[PDB]
């Protein structure tokens, strides 16, 4: 359902946006 | 984030209560224990205001009010939906105002200045306390105190004034309106004088205290001076707050008829002209 898609997308954003994962993209 | 000369004065000590634990600055603000308690009372009171906004479904700063309990409630604790939130916010506001004034006492001690500012603020706080406690004590219940709404406390002022028919004629109201008008008049005069002395026409030098003295001597025959204008200003604003105390504590408790009838009761019958 649409709500299931929203919840899955939010969870995926939380996983990808988690510091241990988002910090893998640091470019200094 | 700190004034060019600020660090020169940012020293420890001067606390009434708080020691060195709360004796610090967050950005520009000095904190102190009374700053901590002022933030507590302010934020908790605003959260109770938001709670009333939630339960009343009134998410408008203008339409939202925390009204005191009903008159039949007396001094009893009210349900939060029946004036209890107003009682909580009254405690919060008294605490926040007292904590703010005491933090200003701390700041005045730290700067070595007199406590005149927290004293004047405490005069305003005394109005609030005597209005929200003295009027309930006089009239027998929290319901006689004004509510907490941006616009709705104006409605309370309207209705309490019209309870005595024509509130303009109230002696304390007449004196206090004269005092507010005199305070704005004197603030206009004083700001204008200081700016006139320090901002003459372009190309003119900054004038002196002699200039401002002779300006008001030429203007109205009297110049109150540098010290006198600030003493008179503190006096005018304070006295208007005391007049507010007397007005809010007398309309109803000490005259339940019209203030027009109050004036008729004594002034026309003064025997020097009642014949």
């Amino acid at each position: 359902g649409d709500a299931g898609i929203v919840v899955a997308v939010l969870v995926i954003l939380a996983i990808l946006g988690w510091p241990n994962i988002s910090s893998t993209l640091r470019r200094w | 984030a700190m004034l060019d000369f600020e660090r020169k004065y940012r020293v420890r000590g001067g606390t009434l209560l708080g020691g060195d634990l709360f004796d610090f600055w967050v950005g520009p603000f000095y904190v102190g224990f009374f700053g901590v308690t002022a933030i507590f009372c302010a934020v908790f009171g605003f959260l109770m205001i938001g709670l009333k906004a939630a339960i009343s479904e009134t998410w408008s700063i203008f339409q939202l009010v925390l009204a005191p309990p009903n008159l039949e409630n007396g001094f009893a604790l009210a349900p939060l939906d029946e004036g209890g939130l107003w009682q909580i916010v009254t405690a919060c506001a008294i605490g926040a105002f007292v904590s703010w004034a005491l933090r200003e006492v701390e700041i005045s001690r730290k700067l070595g200045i007199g406590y005149h500012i927290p004293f004047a603020f405490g005069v305003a706080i005394s109005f609030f306390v005597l209005a929200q406690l003295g009027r309930p004590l006089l009239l027998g219940g929290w319901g006689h105190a004004f509510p907490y709404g941006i616009i709705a406390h104006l409605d309370w002022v309207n209705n309490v004034g019209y309870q005595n028919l024509h509130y303009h004629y109230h002696w304390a109201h007449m004196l206090g309106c004269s005092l507010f008008f005199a305070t704005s008049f004197a603030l206009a005069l004083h700001g204008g004088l200081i700016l006139s002395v320090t901002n003459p026409k372009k190309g003119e030098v900054v004038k002196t205290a002699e200039h401002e003295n002779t300006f008001f001597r030429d203007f109205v025959g009297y110049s109150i001076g540098s010290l006198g204008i600030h003493r008179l200003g503190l006096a005018l604003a304070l006295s208007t707050s005391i007049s507010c105390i007397f007005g809010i504590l007398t309309t109803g408790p000490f005259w339940s008829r019209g203030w027009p009838e109050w004036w008729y009761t004594w002034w026309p019958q003064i025997p020097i002209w009642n014949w």
Partner: protein, 62 residues
Amino acid sequence: IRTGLTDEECQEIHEMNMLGMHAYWSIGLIANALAYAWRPFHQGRAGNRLEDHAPDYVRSAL
């Protein structure tokens, strides 16, 4: 403060910055996903007013 932030100082500030921002971001995303699975935030074309779906005896705050 007689000198500005070094690249090292600014980098160690930004490490904590990114940790805090992205931890709050992910925890908020999880919280919002939980609240969305609880009750989806956005109504469908049918809406989600009780008055439009519940029987008459189900009181609604509108």
